[PDB]
Design a protein around this ligand. Structure first.
Ligand SMILES: *[C@@H]1O[C@H](CO)[C@@H](O[C@@H]2O[C@H](CO)[C@@H](O[C@@H]3O[C@H](CO)[C@@H](O)[C@H](O)[C@@H]3O)[C@H](O)[C@H]2NC(C)=O)[C@H](O)[C@H]1NC(C)=O
Ligand SMILES: *[C@@H]1O[C@H](CO)[C@@H](O[C@@H]2O[C@H](CO)[C@@H](O[C@@H]3O[C@H](CO)[C@@H](O)[C@H](O)[C@@H]3O)[C@H](O)[C@H]2NC(C)=O)[C@H](O)[C@H]1NC(C)=O
Ligand SMILES: *[C@@H]1O[C@H](CO)[C@@H](O[C@@H]2O[C@H](CO)[C@@H](O[C@@H]3O[C@H](CO)[C@@H](O)[C@H](O)[C@@H]3O)[C@H](O)[C@H]2NC(C)=O)[C@H](O)[C@H]1NC(C)=O
Ligand SMILES: *[C@@H]1O[C@H](CO)[C@@H](O[C@@H]2O[C@H](CO)[C@@H](O[C@@H]3O[C@H](CO)[C@@H](O)[C@H](O)[C@@H]3O)[C@H](O)[C@H]2NC(C)=O)[C@H](O)[C@H]1NC(C)=O
Ligand SMILES: *[C@@H]1O[C@H](CO)[C@@H](O)[C@H](O)[C@H]1NC(C)=O
Ligand SMILES: *[C@@H]1O[C@H](CO)[C@@H](O)[C@H](O)[C@H]1NC(C)=O
Ligand SMILES: *[C@@H]1O[C@H](CO)[C@@H](O)[C@H](O)[C@H]1NC(C)=O
Ligand SMILES: *[C@@H]1O[C@H](CO)[C@@H](O)[C@H](O)[C@H]1NC(C)=O
Lengths: 133, 250, 133, 250, 250, 250, 133, 133
């Protein structure tokens, strides 16, 4: 929601040497997809995956000190716009993204909670069913 | 040693039936919660009510039996999956210009309180879609009527209707969806109404134009010329609005 | 939206040996989090990450033939409930989840598209700003 | 010489019946009008239609018979006083969610045109208040229903009602007041409707609170939280207005 | 060899200014699109309009210059980021009972068509929040008025106001947010209205009770007693509804 | 002997002024009433208030003076005809978004109570139609504004208006009709308001289409798509109704 | 509001020998006039004069015993329909109709009350004047 | 609706010598009655009789030239306020007031039209009867 965010995004573009005309090759990663979905719910579904992608990418460069300020500024813009500045929302999100699919114990809990998750994808009292089919 | 065990739950009144020699300590653990909740201490085989201990969700719970060093855990998939839902209760009441059918939802009894099983977060958000079989007069062909959930509240469903002959009704509920709960049919109730010409002000959305036509006539005959036009313009806007609201039921 | 889905979820619970009382240890993976968010947008954000978790887990077991029918049935319930049976929506989702953060070329495109993504998180014409601050 | 004379008028179809030898010229004079209107020239005894000649009012008219130098005038008090009104016509029509009773007013036939006898200035402003006898099923106790004039137009009266059993109806009209006109009973008509649960959106003025309660519930479940309050406030004003209009029928 | 190059875009009218010896082929590539779009063939140094070639987004585009084997690409961050927005146009019009201020949005000229820069998906969804400086009479203290976006359409913003003295106005726009676009001030316009008592039926939400009070009085004096109560009840519901709608502007 | 006598009444405060030697008994008789009402006993010449004794009507009253055997009656045509009406009182109050002009009706003082002279059956049903002279800024051409009686109550008239410059006002009342009462001009009052952009939600009947247009835009931007259509339909009916009410002021 | 009223009106027609065709000569007395005015106020103005005409006519035949019942029945229908069965309304009406224009004292009172009567014909607070002419 | 009307009414008061305190004897002729009836219909009924009284009184003094202007002015105020300036309405009214109750022919026509008059006092289509008694 400001000029500083643009300034830091540009600094990252320079640092990653992503300003050459050949970068444009092979369509886009996120631009086209974000354009295909306008309903808020569909957008959140896609943005959630794009945001986790960026957090993971940034995490893989937490050593480069020179761009740390740029990254921190970008992450803050995401906390504000995507997480609405809600720290609990961001923490839960990050908890989900860190679960390991190869951890045998995590696997068992995931499989055990599967039915409840499925029930949560289509909330019973929220499914506008008015009459028997 | 536990030689037989069975868990059953009807309208969330959960019970365990088991056999074994001697006395046992009975406790329960819910998925996601570390501690075992002691339910019974040093008790003999039989049928025991354990309502309230199992969590009302889709994840498992374990019932543990202990006697000295002996220990055995009984697995259950999840109360929302296992629970059976009893039949609803139907009541027919006569009024001067119509008959009311009232369907009371099956309920859970938490002590002395009766909790209706209808869209409650603490009870799997379960709610039944009802079908009523109407028997008019001495017909052998019952009329099948699907109750609109818009006519239901946390307590039950209310349907007003009219007929001059005897009517008997019974209803059955189903949740459909992930939990495929189907209830038994309720008992049948009958009622014989008085003979009368049963009329209505606004029968449906399609009847609004008739309501408008009639009221235009009433305004014209009832008030003086000067107030005619104004009252009729307001009738026009109210008629459009009634139609708009009724369209929400489309 | 049926009994078969529950039946297959249970079959998976058995296959993964996730029915022992000790599985319940350490709170839950998804149950608590899904309970913390009721607004549709917040739910989609969390569910998107949970759904991608399950797709990745299932992918890691595409060899076990014995449970393939169970998995296929579960995935179908998710296509119906989470993706609303929209194949394009599911394909875009899967495209996002497969992008590699270690691929140098992907990295450059991601960094290059960062500003547009940020602009998409807070749609300009959609931010109800009525007057100058 | 006129040896017998009788004037009769049913639904304003006026006729004179008379006897006498030879041919006669027949003319008519209305109170307040100077000139005699010739109706028939050189005609023999019999029954003659004179519809249209007598004025439709409460003052007299005279029918004059002439033959050469012979002349005789026949006095009548006034057509509005003498006219008899025939029975109405009843029709029963079945619809998906109700039965319609239609009462067609007795009519005058001015040539080929059928003119309904209902509040017309050219026909004494006469209008009938109807009473209908409803026979439901095989009951021996007919229900007496008084038709509200608000349900009538220049053509007839329309009453929508509901029942699942056989219904037969006949109606009779009366003007009361100065002119004590009473009509014969119409012929009886029956109809057997289909068995169905007959419901209504708004049954009467007393049913509006239920309409409001239900719609409040529909709005809450159908729309997002933000629009809830606004839509519900408009429902409140529309409910008050429906009640206000229905109160006009009090 | 290109010795100097500069890209500029005002209201999406994009131009490139460059120097170099000889003729050159000029083409442009947008991020995400494989092919270069030829814009100019064998042209000499100068200023060239390239409106329409750069995509209106936040990703980059490259302008390539070629002369034989020589080739150089000029990078630009993204048109939505680089574009400058010109000032709006203000117009003051006098009416019998008020003065209208009209702010026309800065516009892009696609050939002969003028496209308003306001919430268009093909133009970064950019829209300006306006601030107007009102100068009344000969005051040295201008009044600062922030235009509500609810008073704006794709064409411009409309503000009706009243005063009996001379008024001059100029306006400036800003987008705030990610794109920090700030426009220059528009030119100033003045207008001298006629002296008059400027009144209103409903000034604001807080003025509805006065509207209701007055109309209740009007109904009571204007219509007969019988229609009083009905008309007043409808006034009550309409007053509640006007308030509800006005509350949407809260 | 009474040598001079004069009756005067301003705002129903009636007084008699007379001269004569000695003391006198003063009494009054109203047309249609048999008995004389004693007002003063054994009093000397001077000015005496007799408010309340003369009836407020169009028929005469007589004031009788007695001294021993001497007696003289003074005739007056009727108080409603003779009474003079004083000037009204004007007050200017400033509010955040408008200026209020308040015209207080001339009043009668019955003891300590102030009774407004406005449509009272006990005061000839007299009421004034007001004309206000508005002076804006330093203009030498005052604006003539006729106050609509719909803006007046038993207490006074209220007019809300807006301007950014200094305003001074004075008002005068007239009854017209049978009683040709004309009041003196009130004293002049001024007020200097703050400079501001004075706006209104609904300026007049002709401004409703703009209100509807704007609110349609607000609903579309403020609520989700689903609620759009419904809210907009209600806006349509409310807009028609506001217009209908405003038309009552035509 | 009944058949008896018609029956008695007819009896009077016979008694007065007003059933001959020549009675119809010279248009009508009241029929045409009552037809010219439909507004309630205009009707009352005309009916008031017609009702006073009939009361005076009946008064001039208060001796004929044979038709007294007929007259009494007609007058009652008028009390019900024209005076709405209000005895005070009928008494005031009759008081007005009996005032003598030749009585010197009555004349003075009438002239004296003239201005108030004029004021009553056009009630001040009832004349919808909203603004100064 | 003016000062001239008051001026002429006063001139008549003087001419008739109706300004002495003893004129007030015996209550009033019209003041009290007009006060008893506020409903428009009841008022018209009474005013009609008061207006005919005044027209007859004025007619009895059509010779006094000195007050003719006063009378003409008063009558005009009545034409405006009571007859609403409608000449046909005034002519019909005057026709009714001039019918002679002693004229044998008038008597027969009146008796003959009695039933129609009665029907006109309570208009059939206007009597709000909605249901059978
Ligand atoms: C059901 O659970 C209860 C509660 O744990 C069991 O009772 C407990 O049993 C233990 C072992 O028999 C008792 O411990 C003993 O305590 C005495 C006294 O200090 C000590 O001398 C022994 O060496 C031993 O530690 C414990 O006191 C007792 N608790 C109480 C208060 O009853 C019970 O055995 C269980 N029943 C079954 C069927 O297993
Ligand atoms: C019914 O009415 C008709 C029409 O008035 C009567 O006919 C008319 O009768 C008179 C007398 O008989 C005829 O007058 C005669 O005319 C001839 C020819 O000029 C003349 O020579 C005689 O001295 C006498 O004036 C008249 O012509 C005749 N009109 C016509 C054209 O038919 C008829 O008599 C009436 N019928 C009855 C049953 O009374
Ligand atoms: C701007 O772009 C145009 C279009 O590509 C360039 O023109 C093209 O230039 C090439 C090389 O000079 C020409 O190729 C030659 O064609 C002839 C004929 O077959 C052949 O004998 C040569 O060996 C060579 O292949 C090509 O024909 C020409 N195209 C046309 C139709 O004009 C132009 O050179 C560029 N200008 C600049 C400033 O670089
Ligand atoms: C104003 O009115 C008062 C009240 O009527 C007048 O006073 C009354 O005057 C009469 C005659 O002077 C008094 O009558 C006398 O009474 C005595 C006592 O019984 C008697 O002896 C005499 O023969 C005569 O009848 C009467 O008493 C008196 N009333 C009272 C109580 O004061 C007064 O005269 C009037 N004033 C003027 C200026 O005319
Ligand atoms: C309800 O109607 C259906 C339709 O045939 C019938 O099969 C069923 O038996 C009825 N309900 C019961 C079980 O009585
Ligand atoms: C209508 O009902 C009444 C009530 O008893 C009955 O007397 C009458 O016969 C019925 N109508 C007819 C004449 O069939
Ligand atoms: C508008 O008002 C502000 C407030 O002081 C002032 O600084 C500014 O100069 C005005 N607009 C212009 C630039 O004329
Ligand atoms: C009000 O305006 C009129 C119009 O010219 C003027 O004549 C009058 O003097 C003003 N009021 C007063 C008396 O100040």
């Amino acid at each position: 929601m400001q000029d500083p965010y643009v300034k830091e995004a540009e600094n990252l573009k320079k640092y990653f040497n992503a300003g050459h005309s050949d970068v444009a090759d092979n369509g886009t990663l996120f631009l086209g997809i974000l354009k295909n979905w306008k309903e808020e719910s569909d957008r959140k579904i896609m943005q959630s995956q794009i945001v986790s992608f960026y957090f993971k990418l940034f995490k893989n460069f937490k050593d480069d000190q020179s761009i740390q300020k740029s990254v921190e500024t970008i992450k803050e813009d995401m906390n504000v716009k995507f997480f609405n500045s809600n720290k609990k929302k961001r923490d839960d999100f990050e908890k989900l993204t860190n679960y390991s699919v190869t951890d045998l114990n995590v696997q068992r809990k995931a499989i055990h909670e599967l039915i409840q998750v499925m029930a949560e994808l289509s909330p019973a009292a929220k499914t506008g069913k008015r009459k028997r089919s | 040693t536990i030689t037989s065990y069975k868990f059953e739950s009807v309208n969330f009144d959960s019970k365990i039936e088991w056999t074994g020699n001697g006395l046992y300590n009975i406790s329960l653990r819910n998925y996601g919660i570390k501690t075992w909740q002691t339910m019974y201490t040093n008790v003999p085989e039989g049928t025991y009510d354990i309502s309230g201990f199992p969590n009302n969700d889709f994840v498992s719970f374990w019932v543990k039996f202990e006697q000295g060093d002996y220990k055995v855990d009984k697995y259950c998939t999840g109360l929302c999956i296992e629970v059976k839902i009893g039949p609803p209760t139907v009541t027919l009441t006569e009024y001067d210009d119509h008959i009311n059918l009232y369907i009371e939802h099956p309920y859970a009894t938490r002590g002395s309180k009766k909790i209706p099983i209808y869209k409650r977060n603490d009870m799997c958000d379960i709610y039944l879609l009802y079908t009523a079989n109407f028997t008019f007069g001495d017909s052998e062909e019952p009329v099948i009527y699907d109750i609109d959930d818009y006519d239901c509240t946390s307590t039950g469903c209310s349907i007003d209707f009219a007929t001059t002959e005897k009517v008997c009704v019974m209803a059955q509920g189903a949740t459909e969806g992930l939990l495929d709960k189907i209830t038994p049919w309720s008992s049948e109730v009958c009622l014989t109404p008085k003979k009368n010409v049963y009329t209505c002000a606004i029968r449906s959305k399609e009847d609004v134009p008739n309501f408008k036509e009639k009221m235009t006539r009433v305004i014209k005959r009832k008030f003086n010329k000067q107030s005619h036009s104004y009252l009729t313009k307001f009738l026009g806007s109210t008629s459009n609005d009634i139609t708009t609201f009724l369209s929400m039921l489309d």
